[PDB]
Amino acid sequence: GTSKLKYVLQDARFFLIKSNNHENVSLAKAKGVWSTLPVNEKKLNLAFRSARSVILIFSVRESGKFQGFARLSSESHHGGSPIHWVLPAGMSAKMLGGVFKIDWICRRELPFTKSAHLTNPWNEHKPVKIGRDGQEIELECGTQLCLLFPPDESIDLYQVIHKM
Ligand SMILES: O=c1cc(C2CC2)[nH]c(=O)n1-c1ccccc1
Numbered sequence: 061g062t063s064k065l066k067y068v069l070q071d072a073r074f075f076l077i078k079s080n081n082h083e084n085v086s087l088a089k090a091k092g093v094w095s096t097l098p099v100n101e102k103k104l105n106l107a108f109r110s111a112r113s114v115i116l117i118f119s120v121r122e123s124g125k126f127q128g129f130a131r132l133s134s135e136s137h138h139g140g141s142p143i144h145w146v147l148p149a150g151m152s153a154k155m156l157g158g159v160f161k162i163d164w165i166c167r168r169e170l171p172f173t174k175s176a177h178l179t180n181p182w183n184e185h186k187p188v189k190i191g192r193d194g195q196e197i198e199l200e201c202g203t204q205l206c207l208l209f210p211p212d213e214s215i216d217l218y219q220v221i222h223k224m
Pocket of ligand 1: 080081084095096145147
């Protein structure tokens with residue numbers, strides 16, 4: 061069912077995350093981590109202290125889909141185990157901010173065709189698929205977007221709830 065998911069999303073904040081490729085989303089799904097550029101790192105750290113849940117909704121560039129969504133479990137930190145991200149041309153690992161721990165809520169994909177009825181007030185009511193990395197998605201739009209994803213029966217939200 062969807063009741064524990066709705067509980068996790070209650071009064072959450074939501075951010076669109078772009079990945080240049082599928083490899084980085086695969087690494088994020090396996091290791092429970094993400095890293096963004098410093099401008100977005102500052103926004104996410106502020107949000108993490110501001111709200112009961114901060115949800116990252118992932119989309120690989122040019123894929124026409126979202127690849128899942130996850131909840132921040134920490135502010136960003138430096139000096140942890142190395143992660144062999146595959147970054148875009150002209151970007152080095154030193155340009156990244158720190159590493160956020162994340163707990164995946166759904167590792168299933170959602171094609172953009174299924175979200176065409178949702179618009180984001182914080183991006184001029186453009187379709188929610190449209191946005192730069194780090195674009196905040198307003199609560200109602202973000203909640204409805206997450207509820208569109210296929211249920212991920214491999215995930216037990218009981219432990220995620222205990223972190224809130
Ligand atoms: O492409 C990537 C790949 C990553 C991986 C470390 C996780 N993190 C990012 O933030 N980007 C990004 C998105 C939009 C604009 C500039 C960079």
